[PDB]
Amino acid sequence: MASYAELFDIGEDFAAFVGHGLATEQGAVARFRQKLESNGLPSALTERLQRIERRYRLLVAGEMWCPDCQINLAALDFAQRLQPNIELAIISKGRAEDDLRQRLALERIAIPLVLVLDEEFNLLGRFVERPQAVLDGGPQALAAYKAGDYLEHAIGDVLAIIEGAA
Length: 166
Ligand SMILES: [Mg+2]
Known about the structure:
The protein is α+β, with helices and mostly antiparallel strands. Helix content is 54%, strand content 14%. Pfam families: Thioredoxin_9.
């Protein structure tokens, strides 16, 4: 069983992950990123992000062909660019199936799977596939989600995990 430190160490950074995508997938990521960058974050979110003083690691299982990865990882990368204390490293879906599924008591790996770790690699919580507001909204919210209307929420969900951990 690889440690979280070992898995984080072999994960790719976001730029390298995007760089292995098909051009169409790279374009999708660029545009979700531009949407978040032009629309900006709500001031309360910017505040929450500014309060992160300790280092946190996001161990992510994801793939560039997955729309849910394109969307939510564009958002989480934006957060790491605004707050260097947060760092993402990305491993494959297959690797999460081989080395995380049983450890996490998951039936299958739905991507992106985002494990929020502290500086000691303690597991603080998880973001799984889509933000809570999208899960809550159901089928009728998918359209707005697939269009990027819940990018800030991916960031908010991860921040709540960090904030909830005292
Ligand atoms: Mg690099």
